[PDB]
């Protein structure tokens, strides 16, 4: 009875996997360019911090602490880029599978929501790379400048950078999702100050999910989520 639908899932997953593989090939063909794009803020921050240190006194750089670390980082970056470029095909197949499983009243919501979410995710990633990362990296490296030497390794930096980019994309999508919902009489200010009690618990559960078992990481991930919820309250208040 699941047969007429398992064939479609198989075929669409095959197309999505093929798209991801082609994207991985195209990305690994240009892994140097993507790696330079990723590492440009780090190099700029290190050069600026070196300038500050030389000014004060009158080194640190990007390293690799694993033998296969550079190759693994290149593969990871190429895989992430392949997923990102295959996301059009992936979401096309996913919607085509879920479309004849949704009533004729949820498509009209899901399409503009998905489109606006994608645009705001792109805007957030660009904002993080160009306006946040240059200042944040400089502040973080200058923080441990008079005590430690910044021998920054690429393996952890890649994960840190991707996490920042994805988090900023989501932090740009949530306050636009709030506006979109508030347009259609769905959530109002009162509706947002009455489910706050469960909202903070859900926020902390999400922080526990997306961070290592460390408590401090959970709190440091829950605080920006709380700020985004507070901003959402104002947005739905002035909607």
């Amino acid at each position: 009875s699941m047969k007429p639908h398992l064939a479609e899932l198989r075929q669409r997953l095959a197309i999505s996997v093929l798209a991801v593989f082609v994207g991985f090939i195209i990305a690994f063909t240009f892994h140097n360019a993507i790696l330079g794009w990723i590492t440009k803020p780090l190099n700029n921050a290190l050069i600026q911090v070196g300038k500050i240190v030389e000014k004060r006194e009158m080194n640190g750089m990007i390293t690799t602490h694993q033998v296969g670390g550079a190759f693994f980082v290149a593969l990871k970056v190429s895989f992430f880029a392949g997923i990102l470029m295959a996301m059009p095909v992936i979401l096309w197949q996913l919607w085509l599978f879920i479309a004849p499983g949704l009533y004729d009243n949820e498509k009209k919501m899901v399409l503009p929501f998905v489109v606006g979410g994608s645009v705001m995710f792109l805007i957030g990633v660009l904002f993080a790379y160009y306006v946040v990362t240059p200042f944040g990296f400089q502040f973080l490296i200058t923080f441990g400048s008079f005590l430690y030497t910044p021998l920054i390794n690429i393996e952890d930096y890649v994960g840190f950078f991707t996490k920042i980019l994805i988090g900023f994309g989501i932090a740009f999508e949530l306050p636009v999702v709030a506006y979109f919902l508030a347009l259609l009489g769905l959530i109002t200010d009162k509706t947002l100050k009455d489910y706050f009690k469960y909202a903070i618990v859900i926020i902390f559960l999400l922080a526990a999910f997306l961070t290592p078992p460390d408590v401090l990481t959970q709190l440091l991930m829950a605080a920006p989520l709380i700020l985004l919820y507070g901003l959402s309250i104002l947005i739905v208040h002035y909607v």
Binding site: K197, Y198, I200, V201, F204, A208, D214, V215
Partner: peptide
């Protein structure tokens, strides 16, 4: 539990007792 610790369980329980009550 998929990168989740017991201390995190305790923190979420603390939040639940504090804010719900």
């Amino acid at each position: 539990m998929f990168g989740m610790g017991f201390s995190e369980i305790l923190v979420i329980a603390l939040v639940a007792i504090l804010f719900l009550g």
